[PDB]
Design an enzyme around this catalytic site. Structure first.
Site, PDB file in Angstrom:
ATOM      1  N   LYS A 161       2.740   5.956   6.445  1.00  0.00           N
ATOM      2  CA  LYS A 161       1.937   5.035   5.652  1.00  0.00           C
ATOM      3  C   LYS A 161       2.474   3.619   5.786  1.00  0.00           C
ATOM      4  O   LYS A 161       3.664   3.377   5.567  1.00  0.00           O
ATOM      5  CB  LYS A 161       1.913   5.453   4.178  1.00  0.00           C
ATOM      6  CG  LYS A 161       0.953   4.639   3.304  1.00  0.00           C
ATOM      7  CD  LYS A 161      -0.499   4.866   3.701  1.00  0.00           C
ATOM      8  CE  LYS A 161      -1.459   4.019   2.865  1.00  0.00           C
ATOM      9  NZ  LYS A 161      -1.488   2.596   3.299  1.00  0.00           N
ATOM     10  N   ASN A 175      -8.859  -0.379  -2.045  1.00  0.00           N
ATOM     11  CA  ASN A 175      -7.952  -0.469  -3.188  1.00  0.00           C
ATOM     12  C   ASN A 175      -8.650  -0.115  -4.494  1.00  0.00           C
ATOM     13  O   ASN A 175      -8.080   0.665  -5.279  1.00  0.00           O
ATOM     14  CB  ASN A 175      -7.308  -1.856  -3.248  1.00  0.00           C
ATOM     15  CG  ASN A 175      -6.234  -2.045  -2.200  1.00  0.00           C
ATOM     16  OD1 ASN A 175      -5.569  -1.092  -1.801  1.00  0.00           O
ATOM     17  ND2 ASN A 175      -6.056  -3.282  -1.749  1.00  0.00           N
ATOM     18  N   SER A 186       1.598  -3.518   2.835  1.00  0.00           N
ATOM     19  CA  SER A 186       1.852  -4.946   2.896  1.00  0.00           C
ATOM     20  C   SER A 186       1.356  -5.606   1.621  1.00  0.00           C
ATOM     21  O   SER A 186       0.345  -5.193   1.049  1.00  0.00           O
ATOM     22  CB  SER A 186       1.168  -5.589   4.109  1.00  0.00           C
ATOM     23  OG  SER A 186       1.591  -4.985   5.323  1.00  0.00           O
ATOM     24  N   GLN A 228     -10.989  -4.536  -1.259  1.00  0.00           N
ATOM     25  CA  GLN A 228     -10.421  -5.248  -2.391  1.00  0.00           C
ATOM     26  C   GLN A 228     -11.418  -5.311  -3.540  1.00  0.00           C
ATOM     27  O   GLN A 228     -12.635  -5.343  -3.329  1.00  0.00           O
ATOM     28  CB  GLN A 228     -10.000  -6.686  -2.009  1.00  0.00           C
ATOM     29  CG  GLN A 228      -8.920  -6.778  -0.935  1.00  0.00           C
ATOM     30  CD  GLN A 228      -7.549  -6.365  -1.435  1.00  0.00           C
ATOM     31  OE1 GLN A 228      -7.364  -6.073  -2.619  1.00  0.00           O
ATOM     32  NE2 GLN A 228      -6.576  -6.338  -0.533  1.00  0.00           N
ATOM     33  N   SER A 258       0.798  -1.221   0.000  1.00  0.00           N
ATOM     34  CA  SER A 258       0.000   0.000   0.000  1.00  0.00           C
ATOM     35  C   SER A 258       0.832   1.273   0.000  1.00  0.00           C
ATOM     36  O   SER A 258       0.268   2.352  -0.208  1.00  0.00           O
ATOM     37  CB  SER A 258      -0.936   0.021   1.204  1.00  0.00           C
ATOM     38  OG  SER A 258      -1.989  -0.900   1.024  1.00  0.00           O
ATOM     39  N   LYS A 298       0.443   3.555  -2.917  1.00  0.00           N
ATOM     40  CA  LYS A 298      -0.568   4.607  -2.991  1.00  0.00           C
ATOM     41  C   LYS A 298       0.038   6.002  -2.914  1.00  0.00           C
ATOM     42  O   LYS A 298      -0.590   6.963  -3.378  1.00  0.00           O
ATOM     43  CB  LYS A 298      -1.607   4.422  -1.877  1.00  0.00           C
ATOM     44  CG  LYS A 298      -2.452   3.152  -2.007  1.00  0.00           C
ATOM     45  CD  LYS A 298      -3.488   3.052  -0.894  1.00  0.00           C
ATOM     46  CE  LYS A 298      -4.430   1.880  -1.102  1.00  0.00           C
ATOM     47  NZ  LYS A 298      -3.747   0.568  -0.943  1.00  0.00           N
ATOM     48  N   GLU A 339      -1.045   9.607   5.252  1.00  0.00           N
ATOM     49  CA  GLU A 339      -1.837   9.886   6.442  1.00  0.00           C
ATOM     50  C   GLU A 339      -1.104  10.946   7.249  1.00  0.00           C
ATOM     51  O   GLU A 339       0.109  10.844   7.452  1.00  0.00           O
ATOM     52  CB  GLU A 339      -2.057   8.623   7.274  1.00  0.00           C
ATOM     53  CG  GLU A 339      -2.898   7.570   6.574  1.00  0.00           C
ATOM     54  CD  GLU A 339      -2.776   6.202   7.220  1.00  0.00           C
ATOM     55  OE1 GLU A 339      -2.054   6.081   8.231  1.00  0.00           O
ATOM     56  OE2 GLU A 339      -3.397   5.244   6.713  1.00  0.00           O
TER      57      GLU A 339
HETATM   58  B1  LIG Z   1      -2.178  -1.885   1.993  1.00  0.00           B
HETATM   59  O1  LIG Z   1      -1.044  -2.470   2.424  1.00  0.00           O
HETATM   60  O2  LIG Z   1      -2.769  -1.253   3.021  1.00  0.00           O
HETATM   61  C1  LIG Z   1      -3.158  -2.951   1.377  1.00  0.00           C
HETATM   62  C2  LIG Z   1      -4.151  -3.419   2.440  1.00  0.00           C
HETATM   63  N1  LIG Z   1      -3.590  -4.532   3.187  1.00  0.00           N
HETATM   64  C3  LIG Z   1      -2.975  -4.454   4.437  1.00  0.00           C
HETATM   65  C4  LIG Z   1      -2.581  -5.734   4.792  1.00  0.00           C
HETATM   66  C5  LIG Z   1      -1.872  -6.131   6.084  1.00  0.00           C
HETATM   67  O3  LIG Z   1      -1.888  -5.349   7.070  1.00  0.00           O
HETATM   68  O4  LIG Z   1      -1.281  -7.241   6.165  1.00  0.00           O
HETATM   69  N2  LIG Z   1      -2.946  -6.599   3.781  1.00  0.00           N
HETATM   70  N3  LIG Z   1      -3.577  -5.848   2.784  1.00  0.00           N
HETATM   71  N4  LIG Z   1      -2.402  -4.076   0.852  1.00  0.00           N
HETATM   72  C6  LIG Z   1      -2.991  -4.935  -0.159  1.00  0.00           C
HETATM   73  O5  LIG Z   1      -4.088  -4.716  -0.549  1.00  0.00           O
HETATM   74  C7  LIG Z   1      -2.207  -6.122  -0.714  1.00  0.00           C
HETATM   75  S1  LIG Z   1      -3.209  -6.948  -1.982  1.00  0.00           S
HETATM   76  C8  LIG Z   1      -2.380  -8.444  -2.595  1.00  0.00           C
HETATM   77  N5  LIG Z   1      -2.910  -9.283  -3.532  1.00  0.00           N
HETATM   78  N6  LIG Z   1      -2.064 -10.369  -3.842  1.00  0.00           N
HETATM   79  C9  LIG Z   1      -0.923 -10.405  -3.190  1.00  0.00           C
HETATM   80  N7  LIG Z   1       0.071 -11.447  -3.368  1.00  0.00           N
HETATM   81  S2  LIG Z   1      -0.760  -9.046  -2.083  1.00  0.00           S
END
Ligand SMILES: *[B]([O])([O])[C]([C]N1[C]=C(C([O])=O)N=N1)[N]C(=O)[C]SC1=NN=C([N])S1
Length: 360
Positions: free
Chosen positions: A313, A152, A316, A120, A64, A67, A273
């Protein structure tokens, strides 16, 4: 006496290094920038099976934190006259005209206030037409602009509209315009095969090597950027010193520093943020609480415009963790990169202890 670089290294050893054993993290890169001086600390392996050490060429997935580059690209297109934040997506993606999503403006998309967009994309939404069908079939739930729900797809549509306004694919908006303008030579949306040997493996909760899955093309603005620690230290340097850049890139960076609304103690800027400085640790932890991240929250107009500010920010993917933070008045920032996820609160707590103990 003890030199400043050894002082920072010791603080990173006392606060970030314990997290490797605690969470079985193969590799980590921690970088601090203070008064234009960069300090880089690398731990562990970028590839366990190859016994390859994390180093300054190691490429991590930013999750993220991507972003922030979408927001920077958005501020660039806004200050260059390609978009207006009052515009709606149907203005640039013509197929969305006369559809319910065309009532939300670009700023509301970038700040997650459409009122009915989840964290998502659906799992099946992957091709280009499926993303268009998703937004065409979109219907409002909450009043537009009133509730923040971290999404997202929301900033993905914003990044997609930004790319259309520049007549370039989004990956070229970053790799041909934004990354070169910021001096980033090892930041990628798609890593070339000649750099794959520097691309770290990510590791799941079973410490199995994994890497991010290429989802819908319009998900790259949400979590599709990969970079190194020196490039992220350069990116923090750009946010601390926007005057290092021509007007439109400088105004783009400042656009990402302007908080748009409040959710309790959190200011929602463009990508970043924002918080009043000094911030309590609980203020920074609250920003990554389940209530703020996973649920819709009514937004409030900014009451106190913070004169002295700080930004952060978390980011992950399935096999990577990232955290970036900077305080303009102290001319200091920190980057953390891991090839295994660790709880967001541990990244915030460790960086809080390091930055506050560093002698100004
Ligand atoms: B971003 O990092 O905020 C966003 C939301 N998020 C946070 C976490 C966490 O705290 O572990 N997990 N998701 N990150 C994403 O949306 C990653 S989406 C993916 N799709 N396929 C992958 N191999 S990673």
């Amino acid at each position: 006496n003890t030199p400043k670089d050894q002082e920072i290294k010791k603080l990173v050893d006392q606060n970030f290094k314990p997290l490797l054993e605690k969470y079985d993290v193969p590799g980590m890169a921690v970088g601090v920038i203070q008064n234009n001086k960069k300090y880089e600390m690398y731990y562990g392996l970028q590839s366990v099976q190859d016994k390859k050490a994390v180093n300054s060429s190691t490429i991590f997935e930013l999750g993220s934190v991507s972003k922030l580059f979408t927001a920077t690209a958005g501020g660039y297109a806004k200050n260059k006259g390609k978009i207006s934040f009052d515009d709606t997506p149907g203005k640039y993606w013509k197929e969305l005209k006369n559809t319910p999503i065309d009532q939300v403006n670009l700023l509301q998309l970038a700040t997650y206030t459409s009122g009915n967009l989840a964290l998502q994309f659906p799992d099946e939404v992957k091709t280009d037409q499926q993303v268009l069908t998703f937004f065409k079939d979109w219907k409002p739930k909450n009043s537009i602009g009133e509730y923040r729900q971290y999404s997202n797809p929301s900033i993905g549509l914003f990044g997609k509209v930004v790319a259309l306004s520049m007549n370039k694919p989004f990956d070229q908006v970053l790799e041909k315009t934004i990354f070169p303008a910021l001096g980033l030579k090892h930041s990628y949306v798609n890593v070339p095969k000649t750099q794959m040997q520097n691309y770290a493996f990510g590791y799941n909760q079973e410490n199995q090597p994994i890497r991010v899955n290429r989802g819908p093309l319009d998900a790259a603005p949400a979590y599709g950027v990969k970079s190194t620690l020196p490039d992220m230290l350069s990116f923090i340097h750009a946010n601390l010193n926007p005057q290092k850049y021509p007007a439109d890139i400088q105004r783009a960076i400042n656009e990402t520093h302007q908080g748009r609304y409040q959710v309790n103690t959190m200011y929602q800027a463009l990508g970043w943020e924002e918080f009043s400085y000094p911030a309590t640790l609980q203020t920074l932890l609250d920003s990554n609480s389940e209530q703020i991240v996973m649920k819709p929250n009514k937004v409030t107009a900014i009451s106190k415009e913070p004169s002295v500010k700080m930004y952060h920010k978390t980011g992950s993917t399935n096999g990577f963790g990232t955290y970036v933070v900077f305080i303009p008045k102290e001319n200091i920032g920190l980057v953390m990169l891991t090839n295994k996820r660790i709880p967001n609160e541990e990244r915030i707590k460790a960086a809080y202890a390091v930055l506050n103990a560093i002698k100004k």
